[PDB]
Amino acid sequence: MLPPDILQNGEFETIYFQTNPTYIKSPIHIPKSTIGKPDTVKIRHFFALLHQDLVVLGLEVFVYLQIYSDFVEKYVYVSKCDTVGLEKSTIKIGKVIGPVLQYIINYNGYKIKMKNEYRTLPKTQNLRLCVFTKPAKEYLFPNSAKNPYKNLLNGQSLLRAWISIIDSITKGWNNHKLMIPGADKYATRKFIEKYSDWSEGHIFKKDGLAVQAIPLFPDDPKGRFLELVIVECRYGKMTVSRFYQELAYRQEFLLGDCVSLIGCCKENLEVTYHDDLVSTVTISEYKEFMNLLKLVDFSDRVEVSNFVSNYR
């Protein structure tokens, strides 16, 4: 998951665990009218890098498997990424995030129970990677913003950094899409002018109703608008095109700083299912870890060191 030159035989340590794979309702609305509906299995992944007793950075990723008879639509959603910045930065963060995220994308050792012993997934997978960039001061680590070595990027800088990461781990993929809702074509194109495989737009179905095309991911700027469309029972009228048009005027985008949406796809990848023993936990155990995290003052080495010792 990480190369020796980073971990350095125990100078750095990792926290990494998954939830037990859990069936959920599809994050994309599938009419009960549809033929051969998929089962949806969700896995949460949490990764942190440690340096001695301190957290250096964290990454939370959700994987959604839409399981059809003959193939899987596999969505990989980057939920959160953050840094602590209590110590002067030793590694380039992208050199950690890329490989970890690539490991999560390609991970195929999930132990999925049968739908009411373990289910065998189809060998054909269509990958979809979905990331948004929005320059918050603190995604995972409360009060880290006024740490001395936390490097806070503005929106354009954050976007450039994520395009670089994602490009590096999606070599050969079928498409790479960037949308900056509310920006003109020229401004968006400048971010990807040096990336031959990238183009403006999104990865989802282009026509029809938005809720039947766009996944509703938790704590996603896109998802929050989708949520509104659904709660106001406008799901039956809102098109994909009009959704992306109106997204641009939401407060989060229009008042935001280069808030951007990235999606990449790889079609018809033949995968082999490959046991890889990692720590797996109940959703309650996961949520309990995350709730503890929320209560740590990450400007306080004592509290961070305590949090880490407790996890051990």
Side-chain angles (χ1 to χ4, degrees), residues 56-120:
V56 177
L57 65 89
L59 180 66
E60 183 185 49
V61 182
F62 303 160
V63 172
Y64 302 82
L65 311 172
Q66 309 274 87
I67 304 166
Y68 294 86
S69 295
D70 256 19
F71 58 98
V72 179
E73 296 266 301
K74 174 161 164 190
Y75 291 81
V76 182
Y77 168 69
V78 175
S79 167
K80 289 179 177 57
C81 185
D82 202 6
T83 60
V84 175
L86 279 166
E87 295 182 311
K88 195 249 189 289
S89 157
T90 314
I91 318 95
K92 274 185 185 174
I93 300 289
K95 295 301 217 183
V96 176
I97 297 302
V100 172
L101 179 55
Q102 187 164 51
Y103 175 88
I104 294 173
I105 291 165
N106 291 308
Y107 188 87
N108 293 303
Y110 297 118
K111 310 294 284 163
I112 304 175
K113 293 248 157 85
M114 306 293 303
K115 193 165 178 298
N116 279 101
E117 192 184 6
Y118 291 108
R119 187 171 183 162
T120 312

Side-chain angles (χ1 to χ4, degrees), residues 35-273:
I35 319 190
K37 325 167 159 306
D39 293 338
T40 300
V41 172
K42 176 182 176 196
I43 308 96
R44 307 190 191 190
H45 300 244
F46 183 80
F47 171 85
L49 183 66
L50 310 175
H51 185 243
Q52 310 295 63
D53 52 331
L54 295 183
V55 181
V56 177
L57 65 89
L59 180 66
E60 183 185 49
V61 182
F62 303 160
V63 172
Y64 302 82
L65 311 172
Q66 309 274 87
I67 304 166
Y68 294 86
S69 295
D70 256 19
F71 58 98
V72 179
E73 296 266 301
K74 174 161 164 190
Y75 291 81
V76 182
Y77 168 69
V78 175
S79 167
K80 289 179 177 57
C81 185
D82 202 6
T83 60
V84 175
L86 279 166
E87 295 182 311
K88 195 249 189 289
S89 157
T90 314
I91 318 95
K92 274 185 185 174
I93 300 289
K95 295 301 217 183
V96 176
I97 297 302
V100 172
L101 179 55
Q102 187 164 51
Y103 175 88
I104 294 173
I105 291 165
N106 291 308
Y107 188 87
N108 293 303
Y110 297 118
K111 310 294 284 163
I112 304 175
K113 293 248 157 85
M114 306 293 303
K115 193 165 178 298
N116 279 101
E117 192 184 6
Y118 291 108
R119 187 171 183 162
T120 312
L121 275 43
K123 292 161 177 181
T124 305
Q125 291 189 1
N126 305 317
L127 308 183
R128 293 86 181 72
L129 172 67
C130 303
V131 181
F132 68 90
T133 74
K134 166 166 132 284
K137 67 187 153 98
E138 299 167 4
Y139 277 104
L140 287 165
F141 304 125
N143 271 321
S144 54
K146 261 191 273 278
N147 283 341
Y149 308 107
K150 192 173 180 169
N151 183 28
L152 284 190
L153 298 179
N154 62 25
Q156 63 172 298
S157 288
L158 180 61
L159 174 60
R160 283 189 289 266
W162 270 103
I163 290 165
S164 185
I165 286 156
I166 294 162
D167 189 70
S168 79
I169 64 173
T170 57
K171 296 298 217 328
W173 288 33
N174 297 61
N175 69 12
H176 307 71
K177 305 300 293 199
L178 172 62
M179 187 186 292
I180 303 178
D184 52 78
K185 222 184 263 155
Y186 293 108
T188 308
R189 277 196 163 105
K190 194 179 319 290
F191 284 99
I192 48 167
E193 75 192 339
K194 301 302 189 205
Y195 294 88
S196 60
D197 285 321
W198 288 64
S199 60
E200 199 279 330
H202 62 89
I203 61 164
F204 307 109
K205 199 255 175 36
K206 293 180 179 177
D207 282 78
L209 292 173
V211 294
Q212 288 182 29
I214 306 177
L216 174 34
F217 295 127
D219 208 3
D220 173 5
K222 186 169 73 268
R224 278 183 281 270
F225 186 31
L226 271 176
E227 211 158 57
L228 180 67
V229 171
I230 288 161
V231 75
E232 303 183 348
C233 286
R234 297 148 64 194
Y235 45 82
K237 145 208 71 72
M238 167 101 281
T239 66
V240 177
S241 63
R242 182 53 55 85
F243 172 85
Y244 275 114
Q245 285 174 319
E246 285 291 307
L247 188 70
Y249 310 117
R250 292 222 92 211
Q251 295 183 29
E252 182 164 19
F253 287 89
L254 208 39
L255 305 183
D257 179 13
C258 204
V259 181
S260 313
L261 304 168
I262 295 170
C264 307
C265 298
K266 177 156 189 68
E267 306 309 314
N268 297 320
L269 178 68
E270 174 146 46
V271 308
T272 318
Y273 289 80

